Paper text:
Antibody 3711, encoded by IGHV3‐11 and IGKV1‐17, with a relatively long CDRH3 of 19 amino acids, binds exclusively to the [name]‐[name]‐2 NTD protein, rather than the spike monomer protein. Each spike trimer was bound to three 3711 Fabs symmetrically, highlighting a specific antibody‐spike conformation. Detailed interaction mapping of NTD‐3711 revealed a cryptic epitope surrounded by three N‐linked glycans (Asn17‐NAG, Asn122‐NAG, and Asn165‐NAG), involving 37 amino acids, which form a flat face on each NTD of the Spike trimer. Additionally, Asn31 on the light chain CDR1 (LCDR1) and Tyr49 on LC framework region 2 (FR2) form polar contacts with Asn17‐linked glycan and Ser162, respectively. Ser56 on LC FR3 interacts with the NTD Asn165‐linked glycan, facilitated by Tyr110 on HCDR3, ultimately forming an intricate contact between the NTD, the heavy chain, and the light chain. The glycan‐3711 interaction (Asn17 NAG + Asn165 NAG) occupies 19.7% of the total interaction area, underscoring its pivotal role in antigen‐antibody recognition and neutralization. The T19R/T19I mutation results in the loss of the Asn17‐linked glycan, impairing interaction with antibody 3711, whereas the DEL157/158 mutation reshapes the NTD antigenic surface, causing a clash between 3711 and the NTD.
The N‐terminal domain (NTD) of the spike is an alternative target for neutralization. The surface of the [name]‐[name]‐2 spike monomer displays 22 asparagine (Asn)‐linked glycans, with 8 located in the NTD. To characterize the epitopes of mAbs 3711 and 26434, we solved the Cryo‐EM structures of 3711 and 26,434 in complex with the [name]‐[name]‐2 (WT) spike‐ECD to determine their overall conformations.
Residue numbers in the entry:
A (entry chain A): 14 to 72, 80 to 179, 185 to 245, 257 to 445
B (entry chain C): 396 to 494
C (entry chain A): 495 to 618, 633 to 676, 690 to 691
D (entry chain L): 1 to 214
E (entry chain H): 1 to 228
Write the structure that this text describes.
C-alpha cells in the first residue's frame, strides 16, 4: 500500500520573488470606491517564496513547516496536483487532515492516519482503452477514529495555457481557512505580475494542532511530469486596500515594507507629491526572550492547607504564612474539586507566570449558604461579625463541600 | 454550531472564557472573543448507575494547555518524571485519561 | 453549627481558604512553575523578571538598592532598573526604539526613487539600508542622495542649510 | 505465488525473556507484512500490520523489524498471556499467503513420565477387539517415544497417540498411546509391552503385562 | 462495532454439496476484497478463496479449483461458497475474512486481515450418528507406582464429534485428563479419559465416569474398580 520511490539526490533550494501576490478578502463585507486598511496575517510583498519543481526525475516533495499559514501556487497544464495533508507528526497517536481530489469529487478527512513517507496517487489508463483509468491511492496504511468527513463538488479543476491556481491556508482557533483563485496564465516558468483577489472557498471546523504539511502528486513505473509549485509563509501585516468602482480589489500596499509605502499608507493615497515627510521612529525588534525567577526548589504546602484534618471555626479563623515554595497548583487536579474559586486583582490564566509577595492563607468552615458572603462589600452575619474582606482585595477565595468530614450522625 | 459533552457538577463554572482548571486547560477551552451561549443541566437520572458509570472520561495530564476549540483524543503515555516510558505505563508515567 | 449528613445542601459544611498576596512591587519568594534562562545583556530582548514582563536592553548599573527594594522607577513611573533575583545585581532597562526618520520623494508621479534622512545617526548603524551615497548633515544622515558642490535655490528643504532636488536622473 | 517461511517453529521459553521469530519471503515485498496470533480454539487477530506498526490495543512489548525480505517479530519480557501460535502473512500481492505458525511453549525442569500399561477389558474381548492402552503421565519434553512390542516384536502401524495441552499448573504434558488388535490376533501372543524413551529417563522404561495372568 | 457472521455448515456425506453464507455489518462492503479461509483440525491456516468487488477477479486454491464457487452481493452485504462434490479432506473450520481495502478508494481500518468471523465447522464422513461404546480401564499395579494409581474410561466408536466424559458427576478435578479423540480408519472417533488417585484408595471411594453424547441422547455411568 506504501511505496517510497524517492531518489537520494537532495536538491539546492531555489527561491523566487512573489512581487504582489496572495491578497484575499479578509471579511465578507462589500465595498466600492474606497481605501480600507486592515491588520491581519498576510503574505508580505516582494518576499522570498520557495520554488519546488517536479522535473527532477531526469537522467521530490518534502514535508514543509506550517509556521502561521502558507501561500501555495501551482502552475501545471493538466491536473498533476492533488490535495495536501496537514498535521503535527504525520503518524498515529495524533489526528491529521487530508484533502484529496479523486475523480468527480473532493473529499476531506480528519482522522488518525498512518501516511506513507512518499504518499502519492497513481493513475494509469488515461490512454489504455481510454476507459476506466483506474487509480491507486498510496497515501496511508491505516485510517481509523475519524471525526470529520466531507465530500463535495471538486476544487478548481474545470476546463496552450498553464493554469495558475492560488491557495492560502491558515489554522486559527480550531478552524481551517482556505482561500483560492484560478487564472489561465500564459507566461511560463513563474507566477505572473498581475493582481487577483482570492475569493474564499472553505472554513472547516477541525480543531487539531498543525505544525507540518505535505503535498500529494498524481503520477502516471511512475512518471511525474514537469509542473511546479510555490510555497510562501504568512506574517502579521497591515495592508492598505482599495477595491474598485464595483467591489473587487484592484490594489493594496504593505506599510511595514519600505519607507515610502509608510507614507502612502499614512496619507491614505496611492500617489505621493514632491516633498519630505515624517515617518515612524526607528524601531528595533527583540531577538530573544528571557525569564529570571529566584532559586526556589520546594513545592508549596498544598497538602497541609487543602488536605488538613481539622479546620478552624469562622469566628477564630486561622491564618498561615507561605514562603519559599513553587506554587504549582496542578497537583490539586487529582485529589481536589472546588465548588467556588474566584480571584480579585489578577487573572486566573496569569497565575502561572507571576510571582507573589506576602502570601497568607486564611482557613475556616462555614455553612453552605454563607459562602456567598466571602467577598468584598457583603453584608450578613459572617461578613459583619466573623470575617470581613477588604474592598481593595487582591487574591483568591476557594471553597468546597466537606459534608463527608465535618458531619456526624 | 453546537458542542455537547458531560462533566462533573463542580466543573460547570469552568465553561467560560478565561478560566483555569483541568477542564479548561486539558479538555475544552473557550475563546476570549466568544459569541454564543452556554447551557447546562443536571442529568443524574440518566448518566449514573448504582454500581457506577465509568463510560465518561476526561484528560488529566497534558504537556501544555489547549488552544480555543481544539480537541485532543490522543492516548500516549504521559511522562511526568525524568525517564522515557516507552509506552509501558510504569512509575512516574501515567495513562492520560481517567474516568 | 449543627452539621448532620442529612441536611440540605444549604446547611452542609463548606471549607473555605482565602489566599491573599501582593503583585509586582516588592521582593517575592513564591513564584510559579516557570523556568529561568540565562541573562543576555546589551541586546534587545523580551524579559520576565519576577513576573514583570517587558521589552528592552539590559545593562549593568551603578544604582544601589536598599535590601527591601526590587524595582526602580523613573518620573514617568516606568520600570527602569531591576535587581536580578539570582545574582542580586542591579540592571538598567533602556527602551529599544529611538530616532526620527523622514523620507524625501520627488513625487511618485515622476519616480519611485527616494532618499531617507535618519535624524539621529552620525556616520563617519541604526539604518534600514546602506546603499550608496551616504552623506552626513547637521540634520542627520542622508542616504540615497548624491552630494554636489554647487548651490541653487531651495527645492526640498532638508534642514540646517541643506536642500535636495531631483536633478542630473537622480 | 509468494511463499513464506517461518524459521523457529515450536520455540520454547521461560516467562519474562526475549523471543525472536524470523519470517522470509520469495519475492520483494516492501513493508506489507502482518503478524497474527492464534490461541487454541479462537480466531486469529492482527498484532502488527505494516511490519513495524502495532495496532490499537496491543501492548508495547511486541516489536517488528522489516526489509524487502527477512522480517522479524520480537517479544521482550514474556507474560503468560503471550503463549500462542504466531503466523506471518504477506499483504503485497493477491492471493495473500500465510506462513506456517510457531507454537511457543513454557519452560519446565526435565520431568520423567510416570508410565502405565492397561490390558484390554474382558468386556471388549467379548465384542471381538482388543485395545491396549499405555499412559505417560506428566512430562516436560513432549518429544517422547512410545514403542509397542508384542512378544518382543516392535509393532508398527496399529497404534495411535494423543497428547494434552501443556498443563497450566506444572507445565507438563501427558500422552496416551492405544494399540488396537483383533480378539483373534490378541489371543495369538503373550507379552504386551510398552517401552517409553524420554530425556528424563537414563534408559527407556518398559511397562508390560502377560495376557491371561491375574 | 464491525462484524462478520457465518452460517451453513454441519455434516455432509461425500459426493454431495453445501452452501456457506457470510453476512457483514458496519463496513462499506463494496470497498473490500473478501476471503474464505479454512483450518483443518490439528493443522495451520490456509486460504481457500479471494474475491474482489463486483466479482471480476477471483482466486481459488489449487486444491479446490473447479469444485467451489464464490459469490458476492454488495446490496445484501453477503458472501458465499457453493461447495460441490465434497471430499473427506474438507473437514475443517471455515472463516469469513475481510482484508481488502481496495486501492482505488478512501477506505478505513488497517491494511491487512484485521476483522474475522467466528468459524463454521464442516464435517465430511459417510458415517451418520452413532453412539459410544464404553469400557472401564481398571486401576492396576502396572499402572500403580508408589503413592498413586491411575484408572479411567475408554469411550470409543462414535461419529458425532462432541462427546463428554466426566468423573463422578463432575466431582474429581484432580488428575482427571481427557485425551483428544482419535479418528480411526473406520471413520468413527474414540477417546479415553484417565485420572490418578492415591493407591491406598483403589476401590475405596466412588469413581464413576458419566458419559454423555449430546448429538444423540446417550447418558451412561460406568464404575471403574481394580482388576479381579
Ligand atoms: C471519491 O470519493 C467519494 C467518497 O470517498 C466517492 O463518493 C461516493 O460515491 C458513491 C456513488 O457515487 C456513493 O454511494 C452511494 O451512497 C448512497 C448513500 O447516500 C447510496 O444510497 C447509494 O446507493 C450509493 N451508491 C453506490 C453505487 O454505492 C457514496 O456514498 C459516496 N461516498 C460518500 C462518502 O458519500 C466517489 O465515488 C469517489 N470518486 C470516484 C471516482 O470513485
Ligand atoms: C521508506 O524509507 C524509510 C527510510 O529509508 C523506511 O523507513 C524506516 O524508517 C525508520 C525511521 O523512520 C528507520 O529506523 C528504519 O531503518 C527504516 N526502514 C528500513 C528498512 O531502513 C521505510 O521502510 C521505507 N518504506 C518502504 C515502503 O519501503
Ligand atoms: C465593474 O467594472 C468592470 C470593469 O472595471 C465592468 O466591466 C466593463 O463594463 C463595461 C460597461 O459596463 C463594458 O463595456 C466592458 O466591456 C466591461 N469590461 C469587461 C472586461 O467586462 C463591469 O460592467 C462593472 N460592473 C459590474 C460587474 O456590475
Ligand atoms: C542559585 O543557583 C545558582 C546555581 O544554579 C548559584 O550560582 C552559583 O553561585 C556561586 C557563587 O557563590 C558560583 O561559585 C557557582 O558557580 C554558581 N553556580 C552556577 C551553576 O552557576 C547561586 O549561588 C544560587 N543562588 C544563591 C542565592 O546562592
Ligand atoms: C490528600 O489525601 C488524599 C487521599 O488520602 C491523597 O490522594 C491520593 O493521591 C494519590 C496520588 O495522586 C492517588 O494515587 C490516590 O488514589 C489518592 N487517594 C485516593 C483515596 O484516591 C492526597 O495525596 C493527599 N494530599 C496530600 C497533599 O498529601
Ligand atoms: C502542537 O504540536 C507541537 C509539536 O511540535 C507542539 O510544540 C512543541 O513541540 C516540541 C517538540 O520539539 C515539544 O518538545 C514541546 O513540548 C511542544 N510545546 C509544548 C508547549 O508542549 C505544540 O505545543 C502543540 N500545540 C499545542 C497547543 O500544544
Ligand atoms: C480511538 O481512540 C480511543 C481513545 O480515545 C480508543 O479507545 C481505547 O481503546 C483501547 C483498546 O480497547 C482501550 O485500552 C482504551 O482504554 C480506550 N480508551 C478510551 C478513552 O476509550 C480506540 O481504541 C480508538 N479506536 C481505534 C480504532 O483505534
Ligand atoms: C417587609 C420587609 C422589610 C422591608 C425593608 C426594606 C428595605 C430594607 C433593605 C434591605 C433588607 C434586606 C433584608 C435581607 C437581609 C439579608 C442579610 C444577609 O444575610 O445577607
Ligand atoms: C497553599 C499554597 C498557597 C498558594 C500559593 C500562592 C498563590 C497561588 C495563587 C493561586 C493558586 C490557585 C490555588 C488553586 C486553584 C486551582 C484552580 C482549580 O483547580 O480550579
Ligand atoms: C570625525 C569628526 O567629525 N570630528 C570632528 C572634529 O574634527 C572637530 O574638531 C569637532 C568640532 O567640534 O567635531 C568633530
Ligand atoms: C532569498 O533568500 C536567499 C537566501 O535564503 C537570499 O540570498 C536572497 O537574497 C533572497 N531573495 C530576496 C529577493 O530577498
Ligand atoms: C499625475 O498623474 C495624473 C493621473 O495619472 C495626471 O492627471 C497628472 O497630470 C500627473 N501629473 C503631472 C504633473 O502630469
Ligand atoms: C559626527 O561626529 C563628528 C565627530 O565624531 C562630529 O564632529 C559631528 O558633529 C557629528 N555630526 C554632527 C553633524 O554633529
Ligand atoms: C567638491 O567640493 C570638495 C570640497 O573639498 C572638493 O574637494 C571637490 O574637489 C569638489 N568637487 C567634487 C568632489 O565634486
Amino acid at each position: 500500500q506504501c511505496v517510497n520511490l524517492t531518489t537520494r539526490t537532495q536538491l539546492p533550494p531555489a527561491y523566487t520573488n512573489s512581487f504582489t501576490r496572495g491578497v484575499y478578502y479578509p471579511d465578507k463585507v462589500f465595498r466600492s470606491s474606497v481605501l480600507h486598511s486592515t491588520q491581519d496575517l498576510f503574505l508580505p510583498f516582494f518576499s522570498n517564496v520557495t520554488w519546488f519543481h517536479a522535473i527532477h526525475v531526469s537522467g521530490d516533495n518534502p514535508v514543509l513547516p506550517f509556521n502561521d499559514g502558507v501561500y501555495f501556487a501551482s502552475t501545471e497544464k493538466s491536473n498533476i496536483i492533488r490535495g495536501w495533508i496537514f498535521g503535527t507528526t504525520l503518524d498515529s497517536k495524533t489526528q491529521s487532515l487530508l484533502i484529496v481530489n479523486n475523480a468527480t469529487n473532493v473529499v476531506i478527512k480528519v482522522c488518525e492516519f498512518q501516511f506513507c513517507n512518499d504518499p502519492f496517487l497513481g493513475v494509469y489508463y488515461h490512454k489504455n482503452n481510454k476507459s476506466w483509468m483506474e487509480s491507486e491511492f498510496r497515501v496511508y496504511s491505516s485510517a481509523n477514529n475519524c471525526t470529520f468527513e466531507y465530500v463535495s463538488q471538486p476544487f478548481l479543476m474545470d476546463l496552450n495555457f498553464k493554469n495558475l491556481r492560488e491557495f492560502v491556508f491558515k489554522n486559527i482557533d480550531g478552524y481551517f481557512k482556505i482561500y483560492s483563485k484560478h487564472t489561465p496564465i500564459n507566461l511560463v516558468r513563474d507566477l505572473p505580475q498581475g493582481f487577483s483577489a482570492l475569493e474564499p472557498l472553505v472554513d472547516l471546523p477541525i480543531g487539531i494542532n498543525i505544525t507540518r504539511f505535505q503535498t500529494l502528486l498524481a503520477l502516471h513505473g511512475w512518471t511525474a511530469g514537469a509542473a511546479a509549485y510555490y510555497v510562501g509563509y504568512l506574517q502579521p501585516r497591515t495592508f492598505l486596500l482599495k477595491y474598485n468602482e464595483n467591489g473587487t480589489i484592484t490594489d493594496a500596499v504593505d506599510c511595514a515594507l519600505d519607507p515610502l509605502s509608510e507614507t502612502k499608507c499614512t496619507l491614505k493615497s496611492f500617489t505621493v507629491e514632491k516633498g519630505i515627510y515624517q515617518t515612524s521612529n526607528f524601531r528595533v525588534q527583540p531577538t530573544e526572550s528571557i525569564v529570571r525567577f529566584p532559586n526556589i526548589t520546594n513545592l508549596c504546602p498544598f497538602g497541609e492547607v487543602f488536605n488538613a484534618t481539622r479546620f478552624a471555626s469562622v469566628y477564630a479563623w486561622n491564618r498561615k504564612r507561605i514562603s519559599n515554595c513553587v506554587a504549582d497548583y496542578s497537583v490539586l487536579y487529582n485529589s481536589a474539586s472546588f465548588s467556588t474559586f474566584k480571584c480579585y486583582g489578577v487573572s486566573p490564566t496569569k497565575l502561572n507566570d507571576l510571582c507573589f509577595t506576602n502570601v497568607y492563607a486564611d482557613s475556616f468552615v462555614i455553612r453552605g449558604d454563607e459562602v456567598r458572603q466571602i467577598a468584598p462589600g457583603q453584608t450578613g452575619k459572617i461578613a459583619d461579625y466573623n470575617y470581613k474582606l477588604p474592598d481593595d482585595f487582591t487574591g483568591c477565595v476557594i471553597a468546597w463541600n466537606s459534608n463527608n468530614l465535618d458531619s456526624k450522625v | 454550531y453546537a458542542d455537547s459533552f458531560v462533566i462533573r457538577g463542580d466543573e460547570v463554572r469552568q465553561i467560560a472564557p478565561g478560566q483555569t482548571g483541568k477542564i479548561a486547560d486539558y479538555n475544552y477551552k473557550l475563546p476570549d472573543d466568544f459569541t454564543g451561549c452556554v447551557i447546562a443541566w443536571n442529568s443524574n437520572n440518566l448518566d449514573s448507575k448504582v454500581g457506577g458509570n465509568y463510560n465518561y472520561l476526561y484528560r488529566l495530564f497534558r504537556k501544555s494547555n489547549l488552544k480555543p476549540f481544539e480537541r485532543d483524543i490522543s492516548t500516549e503515555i504521559y511522562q511526568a518524571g525524568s525517564t522515557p516510558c516507552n509506552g509501558v505505563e510504569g512509575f512516574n508515567c501515567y495513562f492520560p485519561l481517567q474516568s | 453549627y449543627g452539621f448532620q449528613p442529612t441536611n440540605g445542601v444549604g446547611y452542609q459544611p463548606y471549607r473555605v481558604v482565602v489566599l491573599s498576596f501582593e503583585l509586582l512591587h516588592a521582593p517575592a519568594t513564591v513564584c510559579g512553575p516557570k523556568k529561568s534562562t540565562n541573562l543576555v545583556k546589551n541586546k534587545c530582548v523580551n524579559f520576565n523578571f519576577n513576573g514583570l514582563t517587558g521589552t528592552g536592553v539590559l545593562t549593568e548599573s551603578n544604582k544601589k538598592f536598599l535590601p527591601f527594594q526590587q524595582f526602580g522607577r523613573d518620573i514617568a513611573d516606568t520600570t527602569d532598573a531591576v535587581r536580578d533575583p539570582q545574582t542580586l545585581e542591579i540592571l538598567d532597562i533602556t527602551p529599544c526604539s529611538f530616532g526620527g526618520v523622514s523620507v524625501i520623494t520627488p513625487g511618485t508621479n515622476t519616480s519611485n526613487q527616494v532618499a531617507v534622512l535618519y535624524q539621529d545617526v552620525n556616520c563617519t548603524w541604526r539604518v534600514y539600508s546602506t546603499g550608496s551615497n551616504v552623506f552626513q548633515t547637521r540634520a542627520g544622515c542622508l542616504i540615497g542622495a548624491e552630494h554636489v558642490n554647487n548651490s541653487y535655490e531651495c527645492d526640498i528643504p532638508i534642514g540646517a542649510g541643506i536642500c535636495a532636488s531631483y536633478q542630473t536622473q537622480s | 505465488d509468494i511463499v513464506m517461511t517461518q524459521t523457529p517453529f515450536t520455540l520454547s521459553a521461560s516467562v519474562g525473556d526475549r523471543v525472536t521469530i524470523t519470517c522470509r519471503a520469495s519475492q520483494g515485498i516492501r513493508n506489507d507484512l502482518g503478524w497474527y496470533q492464534q490461541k487454541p480454539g479462537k480466531a486469529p487477530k492482527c498484532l502488527i500490520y505494516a511490519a513495524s506498526s502495532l495496532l490499537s490495543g496491543v501492548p508495547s512489548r511486541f516489536s517488528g523489524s522489516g526489509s524487502g525480505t527477512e522480517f522479524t517479530l520480537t517479544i521482550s519480557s514474556l507474560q503468560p498471556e503471550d503463549f500462542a501460535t504466531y503466523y506471518c502473512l504477506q499483504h503485497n500481492s493477491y492471493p495473500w499467503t500465510f506462513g506456517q505458525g510457531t507454537k511457543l511453549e513454557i519452560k519446565r525442569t526435565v520431568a520423567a513420565p510416570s508410565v502405565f500399561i492397561f490390558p484390554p477389558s474382558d468386556e471388549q474381548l467379548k465384542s471381538g477387539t482388543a485395545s491396549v492402552v499405555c499412559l505417560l503421565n506428566n512430562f516436560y519434553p513432549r518429544e517422547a517415544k512410545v514403542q509397542w512390542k508384542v512378544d518382543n516384536a516392535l509393532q508398527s502401524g496399529n497404534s495411535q497417540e494423543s497428547v494434552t495441552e501443556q498443563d497450566s499448573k506444572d507445565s507438563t504434558y501427558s500422552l496416551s498411546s492405544t494399540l488396537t488388535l483383533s480378539k483373534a490376533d490378541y489371543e495369538k501372543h503373550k507379552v504386551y509391552a510398552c517401552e517409553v524413551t524420554h530425556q528424563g529417563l537414563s534408559s527407556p522404561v518398559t511397562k508390560s503385562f502377560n495376557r491371561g495372568e491375574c | 462495532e464491525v462484524q462478520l457472521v457465518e452460517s451453513g455448515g454441519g455434516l455432509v456425506k461425500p459426493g454431495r454439496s453445501l452452501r456457506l453464507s457470510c453476512a457483514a455489518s458496519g463496513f462499506t462492503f463494496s470497498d473490500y476484497y473478501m476471503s474464505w479461509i479454512r483450518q483443518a483440525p490439528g493443522k495451520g491456516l490456509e486460504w481457500v478463496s479471494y474475491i474482489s468487488s463486483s466479482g471480476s477477479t477471483i482466486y481459488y486454491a489449487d486444491s479446490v479449483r473447479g469444485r467451489f464457487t464464490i459469490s458476492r452481493d454488495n446490496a445484501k452485504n453477503s458472501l458465499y461458497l457453493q461447495m460441490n462434490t465434497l471430499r473427506a479432506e474438507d473437514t475443517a473450520v471455515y472463516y469469513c475474512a475481510r482484508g481488502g481495502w481496495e486501492l482505488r478508494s478512501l477506505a478505513g481500518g488497517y491494511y491487512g486481515m484485521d476483522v474475522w468471523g467466528q468459524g463454521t465447522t464442516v464435517t465430511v464422513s459417510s458415517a451418520s450418528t452413532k453412539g459410544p461404546s464404553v469400557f472401564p480401564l481398571a486401576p492396576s499395579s502396572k499402572s500403580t507406582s508408589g503413592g498413586t494409581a491411575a484408572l479411567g474410561c475408554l469411550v470409543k466408536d462414535y461419529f458425532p464429534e462432541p462427546v463428554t466424559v466426566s468423573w463422578n458427576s463432575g466431582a474429581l478435578t484432580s488428575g482427571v485428563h481427557t485425551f483428544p479423540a482419535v479418528l480411526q480408519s473406520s471413520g468413527l472417533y474414540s477417546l479415553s479419559s484417565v485420572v490418578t488417585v492415591p493407591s491406598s484408595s483403589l476401590g475405596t471411594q466412588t469413581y464413576i465416569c458419566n458419559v454423555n453424547h449430546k448429538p444423540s441422547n446417550t447418558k451412561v455411568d460406568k464404575k471403574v474398580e481394580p482388576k479381579s
